[PDB]
Amino acid sequence: AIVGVGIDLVSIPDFAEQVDRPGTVFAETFTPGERRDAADKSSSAARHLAARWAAKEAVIKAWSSSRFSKRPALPEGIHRDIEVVTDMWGRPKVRLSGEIAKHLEDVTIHVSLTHEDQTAAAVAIIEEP
Amino acid sequence: AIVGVGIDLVSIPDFAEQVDRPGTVFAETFTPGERRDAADKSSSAARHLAARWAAKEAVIKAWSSSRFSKRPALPEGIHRDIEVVTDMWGRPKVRLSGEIAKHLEDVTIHVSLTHEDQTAAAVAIIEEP
Amino acid sequence: AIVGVGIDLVSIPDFAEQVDRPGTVFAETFTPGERRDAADKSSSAARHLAARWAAKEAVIKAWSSSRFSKRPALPEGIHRDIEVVTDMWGRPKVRLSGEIAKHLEDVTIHVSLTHEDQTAAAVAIIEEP
Numbered sequence: 152a153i154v155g156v157g158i159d160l161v162s163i164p165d166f167a168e169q170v171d172r173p174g175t176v177f178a179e180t181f182t183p184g185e186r187r188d189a190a191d192k193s194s195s196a197a198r199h200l201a202a203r204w205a206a207k208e209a210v211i212k213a214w215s216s217s218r219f220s221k222r223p224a225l226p227e228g229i230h231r232d233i234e235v236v237t238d239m240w241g242r243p244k245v246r247l248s249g250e251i252a253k254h255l256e257d258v259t260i261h262v263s264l265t266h267e268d269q270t271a272a273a274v275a276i277i278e279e280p
Numbered sequence: 281a282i283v284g285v286g287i288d289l290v291s292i293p294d295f296a297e298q299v300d301r302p303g304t305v306f307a308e309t310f311t312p313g314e315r316r317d318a319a320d321k322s323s324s325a326a327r328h329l330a331a332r333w334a335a336k337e338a339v340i341k342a343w344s345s346s347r348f349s350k351r352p353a354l355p356e357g358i359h360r361d362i363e364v365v366t367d368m369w370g371r372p373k374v375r376l377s378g379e380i381a382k383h384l385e386d387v388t389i390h391v392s393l394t395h396e397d398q399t400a401a402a403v404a405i406i407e408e409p
Numbered sequence: 410a411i412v413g414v415g416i417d418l419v420s421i422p423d424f425a426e427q428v429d430r431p432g433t434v435f436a437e438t439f440t441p442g443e444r445r446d447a448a449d450k451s452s453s454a455a456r457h458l459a460a461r462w463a464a465k466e467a468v469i470k471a472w473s474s475s476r477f478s479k480r481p482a483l484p485e486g487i488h489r490d491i492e493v494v495t496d497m498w499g500r501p502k503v504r505l506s507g508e509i510a511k512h513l514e515d516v517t518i519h520v521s522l523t524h525e526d527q528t529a530a531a532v533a534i535i536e537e538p
C-alpha cells in the first residue's frame with residue numbers, strides 16, 4: 152500500500168533569493184559553492200538545485216503525512232537525514248541516514264523531479280509491499 | 281491497487297479573477313468571506329485557497345478517471361460532496377458526504393498540495409487494498 | 410506494486426518555440442498541422458499540446474526509472490512507441506506500440522495532465538498487481 156504522498160512547487164527566483172543565506176535548511180543540504188551558484192536565478196545551477204530542493208520537500212511531505220510522523224512539527228535534522236541526489240542524466244535518488252534511515256528501512260521511496268525556466272516541481276510516493 | 285490519479289495546476293491570478301463570482305463552483309466550496317479575501321491575487325488567502333482548489337480538482341479528476349464514474353459528465357453536487365480542508369500546518373484532509381461518501385467508503389484518498397507565488401498545484405491518488 | 414513514477418513541467422512559451430521544428434521528437438508525436446497551430450503560444454492548441462507533451466514525458470520518465478529500462482539512454486523510437494491522446498473531455502489515454510507495447514503488456518499506466526496559461530504538467534504512475 153501507499154504510505155505517503157507529497158508534491159512540491161518551487162519558484163526558481165524565490166529559491167535563488169533564499170538559497171544562499173547562512174544556517175538555512177538549504178545549508179544542511181547543499182554546499183556553500185552550490186548555494187553561491189544557485190543564487191543566480193538565470194543559471195543552470197539555480198534550475199537544477201531548485202528541482203533537487205522540490206524533491207526533498209516532496210519526500211518530507213510524504214513522510215509528514217505518514218504514520219512515521221508522530222508530532223506535527225518535523226523532527227531534528229530531517230534535513231540531513233534525507234538527501235536527494237541526481238545522476239549525470241538528472242535522475243533523482245533518495246539517500247537516508249540517521250533515525251529516518253532506520254525507521255524507513257522496509258519502505259520504498261519513489262521520486263520524480265522536473266523544471267522549466269521559472270518553476271521547479273517534484274513528486275514523492277512512499278510505498279510498502 | 282491504484283483506483284485513480286489526478287493532478288491540477290492553478291494560476292493564482294486567474295483563480296483570484298474567477299473565485300468571487302456568484303453561483304460558481306467555488307461558491308459551493310468556500311464561504312463568501314473566503315472568496316472576497318481570495319479575490320486579491322497578492323494575498324495569502326489567494327495562494328492558500330487556490331491550493332485548496334487544486335487539491336479538490338485533483339481529487340475529482342482521479343474520481344472521473346476511475347470506475348466510480350459512469351457518465352463522462354460530472355454528477356450533481358460533486359462539488360459539495362467532496363471537500364478538501366487544511367490543518368493549521370496546511371496539511372490537506374479529504375472529507376466526503378452524500379453519494380460520493382457512500383460509494384467511496386472502502387477506498388483511501390491520498391492528496392498533497394503546494395503553491396509558489398504565481399501558481400498552485402495538487403496531486404491525488406485514490407487507492408484500494 | 411508501483412513500477413515507476415514520473416512528473417513533467419512544460420513552459421508553454423518554450424514549447425511553442427520548439428514544437429514546430431523539423432525532425433524534432435515532437436514531429437514523431439504530433440502532425441505538422443498540430444505543430445503549426447501550437448507554435449502560437451497564446452493559442453488553445455499550444456496549451457493542450459503542451460499538456461499532451463508533458464504527459465508523454467512523464468510516462469517516459471516513469472519508464473526510464475523502471476526495471477524495463479536497461480541503458481540510461483532512451484531506446485530508438487520510444488517517442489513513436491508511446492502515444493498519449495485525449496478524449497473530447499480532455500482526459501488522457503496511453504497507447505503503446507512496438508517493443509514498448511510487448512514489454513509493458515502486463516502493467517498499467519496511470520496518467521493525469523493539466524495546464525494553466527503559462528505552464529503545463531502531468532504525472533504518470535506505472536503499476537503492476
Ligand code: NI
Pocket residue numbers: 198199266
Ligand atoms: Ni534542466
Ligand code: NI
Pocket residue numbers: 327328395
Ligand atoms: Ni503558503
Ligand code: NI
Pocket residue numbers: 456457524
Ligand atoms: Ni485547457
